[PDB]
Amino acid sequence: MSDILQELLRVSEKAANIARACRQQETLFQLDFKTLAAVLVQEVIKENMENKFPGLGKKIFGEESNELTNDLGEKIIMRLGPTEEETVALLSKVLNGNKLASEALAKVVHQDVFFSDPALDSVEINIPQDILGIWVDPIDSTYQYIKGSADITPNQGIFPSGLQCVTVLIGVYDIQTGVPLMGVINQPFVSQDLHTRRWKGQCYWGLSYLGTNIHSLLPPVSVVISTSEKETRIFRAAGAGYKSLCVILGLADIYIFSEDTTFKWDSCAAHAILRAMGGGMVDLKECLERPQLVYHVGNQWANKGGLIAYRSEKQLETFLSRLLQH
Ligand SMILES: O=P(O)(O)O[C@H]1[C@H](O)[C@@H](O)[C@H](OP(=O)(O)O)[C@@H](O)[C@H]1O
Ligand SMILES: [Ca+2]
Ligand SMILES: [Ca+2]
């Protein structure tokens, strides 16, 4: 429902805050750290949603485990809190007792966020909690996150690489039918002030429930196609979330992926937002033999057969016609 969606936006901003903190504070920029940040962000999302909506916390699935393996080989189960002290203790257990890295992490983990949207505040939609499943990618395009390029110049509005390709993806789907219902995409690194080195982000939301379709306000902007960097008119770009975003905003009309290296958490949130706009994601191999992606049944959680992401079915039929006449 709209309430759950507002909470998801809030925790998306907290996740973006953790992601930015790990690269803009010197002690965190010091420092496997990428999976540490990913597992931490996923756990922050999960625990916030469980605390605000009891019973939801078990329904939140993601790319990361909640277990980590420190330098000694100890398995540590990630449970934060109940407040900052035990979080600093747990982080000192994972980070070999580096006290100020632990303290900075717990400081931005437990820091309250009051990020809202007046558009979604008046929307009053209720959805029974028992039917909701959640796929979460805490940090999409991890290689661009660690690479940290800030100076990349886009091509026709599309960044081929850089921190702009990093996203936090939170998708909600129907447990029984497998249809995506709700979507949040957080872009933590959209704009950087050259003189303060501070990054401004963006967030996009969508909802598609029983014939009702709402979405966040989009900025104003033959076919334009986005492909990934290792895919084997047409632009290359990093990030599954980011390419779906290019389709959402209209920077591109089709996003094709022919490999089987995406998963439900890569595509769920974006699929829901696209669905709220008349678009969707279809199974690529299924269309070529002549079928929307579902999120309740696995194979394991990979989107086997690749995908096409589209905002307008007009463009999809045009493209498939021209495509398989060769
Ligand atoms: O950048 P591409 O070429 O679109 O490749 C995508 C990449 O962006 C991420 O979505 C990646 O997940 P992750 O970054 O979370 O490991 C996914 O597995 C790759 O297939
Ligand atoms: Ca990821
Ligand atoms: Ca991913």
Quickly list DSSP for 205-264. EEEEETTEEEEPPPPP----EEE-TT---EEE-S-HHHHHHHHHHTS-SEEEE-SS--BH
d(CA 184, CA 289): 32
User: Which residue matches tokens 């100076």?
Assistant: 151
d(CA 263, CA 135): 10
Query: Is ligand 1 within 6 A of the CB of residue 227?
Result: no
Cβ atoms of residues 131 and 296 within 8 Å: no
Among residues 251, 194, 242, which one has the least CA distance to residue 218?
A: 251
Residues after which the chain has a gap (C–N > 2.5 Å): 31, 221, 232, 290, 299
Method in brief: X-ray
Around Cβ 293, how many Cβ atoms within 10 Å? Answer: 23
Cβ atoms of residues 164 and 188 within 8 Å: no
**Among 225, 228, 232, 303, which is best to mutate for testing ligand 1, by the most ligand atoms less than 8 A from CB?**
228
- The closest-lying atom of ligand 1 relative to the alpha carbon of residue 38 is 15
Is 30 buried (19+), middle (13-18) or exposed (0-12) by CB count in 10 A?
exposed
Quickly list DSSP for 50-85. HHHSTT-GGGEEESS-SEEE-TT--EEE----SSHH
Is 290 buried (19+), middle (13-18) or exposed (0-12) by CB count in 10 A?
exposed
d(CA 286, CA 265): 20
Query: Is ligand 1 within 6 A of the CB of residue 232?
Result: no
Two tokens at 251?
């920077």
Ligand nearest to the CA of 161: 1
- The closest-lying atom of ligand 1 relative to the alpha carbon of residue 141 is 14
72 alpha carbon – ligand 1 mean position (Å): 29
Among residues 282, 274, 257, 284, which one has the least CA distance to residue 312?
A: 274
Strand order in the sheet with 280-283: 234-236, 225-227, 254-257, 307-310, 280-283
Query: Is ligand 1 within 6 A of the CB of residue 283?
Result: no
29 alpha carbon – ligand 2 mean position (Å): 19
Q: DSSP character for 97?
A: T
